[PDB]
Structure 1
Amino acid sequence: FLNQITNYAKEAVQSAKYIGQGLSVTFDHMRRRPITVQYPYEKLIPSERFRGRIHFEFDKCIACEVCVRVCPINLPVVDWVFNKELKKKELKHYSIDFGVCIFCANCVEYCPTNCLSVTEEYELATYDRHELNYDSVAMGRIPYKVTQDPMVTPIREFAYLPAGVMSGHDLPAGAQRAGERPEAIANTA
């Protein structure tokens, strides 16, 4: 009967030591700096693979209706007419809804004359949904650069740090893309 009492005392002192170790690691966790970012004061750097808005050009277009069949919902419409003076068709209007858009960038890939483009815009907040049918002259505007804005602070993500950084907040050097670009390898080696 006494062995159960000694086992209970051993479990109690082990639980007290576990509580003390939890207090020790909690006091250890107060030493490190916070690793969060501020908005809209410290905006993240968009990578070359991160997609966004779809930009449309009205000059390098032939109205061939190829990317409409690639889209599962067929959101870009082609308002093409037939002209009797020429032998081809011309585009009149170009509209696309963005509230039902998946943003997967599949119509941009199947394009030989690169008529669609990827634009680094994600800040889209509107009080009404009826204005989402964007016009071609509205999609032909200049994107907002995060570098040229003097009020924001540029900070890269985890995979854009030189030689391996676990925090990625100070960045005292100007190096990026840890590795080597494939241009100096042909010069030296």
Structure 2
Amino acid sequence: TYKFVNMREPSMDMKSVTDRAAQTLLWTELVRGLGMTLSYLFREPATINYPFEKGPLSPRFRGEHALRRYPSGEERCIACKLCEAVCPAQAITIEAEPRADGSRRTTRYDIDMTKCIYCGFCQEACPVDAIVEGPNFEFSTETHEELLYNKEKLLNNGDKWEAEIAANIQADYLYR
């Protein structure tokens, strides 16, 4: 099924041609164009009052990366390196070393925000829900080096946004 978008021949009756000449001389579709914009000025604007008003999001939103931890206090990360092995941009660097207690934890877990693509592949690959993409997105920095995240900075993000991230995962883990 196809339709001819522009295959309309105009009628050549005296009334039709008089109307076409009137539209040409007395600009008619031009007045319609004016009227449409008049109708929308009288309409309500769509602008929101940022930063006092924020655009809507979803619990699945991908933002600032963060390392979570168990309710006991121990970090969830076990240095299985799935996130490092699955990152499309190779933005994660992990070095592991058996801790004094014996549990295997990262001696270095750096995520480079200037190289990250915010795909969320790491948070899917993680088998313990250790690394997540937090809800934060207003974390712009004045210098480049501040975007090269360390293990300590990611742990601070996890401890800061934990209230939001726990609820976000709680409202989405069933879909996964």
Please report the TM-score for the alignment, with normalisation by the length of structure 1: 0.62
How big is the shift at 1:7? Answer: 8.7
* 1:143 aligned residue (131, 148, 161): 161
RMSD across aligned C-alpha pairs, in angstroms? 3.1
Map of 1:121 onto structure 2? 136
| Matched residue, 2:80 | 64
Question: Quick one: distance in 2 between partners of 1:40 and 1:108?
Answer: 29
The 3-state SS of whatever aligns with 1:131 is helix
1:75 aligned partner = 91
Question: Which residue in the other structure is 1:108 paired with?
Answer: 123
Deviation at 1:106, TM superposition (A): 0.5
Aligned to 2:72: none
Gaps (5+ residues) in structure 2? 1-11, 70-74, 165-176
Contact 1:68 1:75 in 2 (8 A): yes
Question: How many matched pairs?
Answer: 141
> 2:59 is matched with which residue: 28, 48, 67?
48
Maintained 8 Å contact 2:77/2:131: no
1:152 corresponds to which residue? none
- Larger strand fraction of residues: 2
Structure 1: runs of 5+ lacking an equivalent:
147-189
For residue 34 of structure 2, what is the aligned residue in structure 1?
23
TM score, norm. by length of structure 2: 0.66
Counterpart amino acid of residue 126 in structure 1: T
Q: Which runs of 4+ in 1 moved over 6 A?
A: 6-9, 85-88
- Which amino acid in the other structure matches residue 135 of structure 1? N
Task: Decide which structure has greater helix share.
Answer: 2
Partner residue in 2 for 1:14? 23
Identical amino acids, percent of aligned pairs: 28
Secondary structure of the residue that 1:79 maps to in structure 2? strand
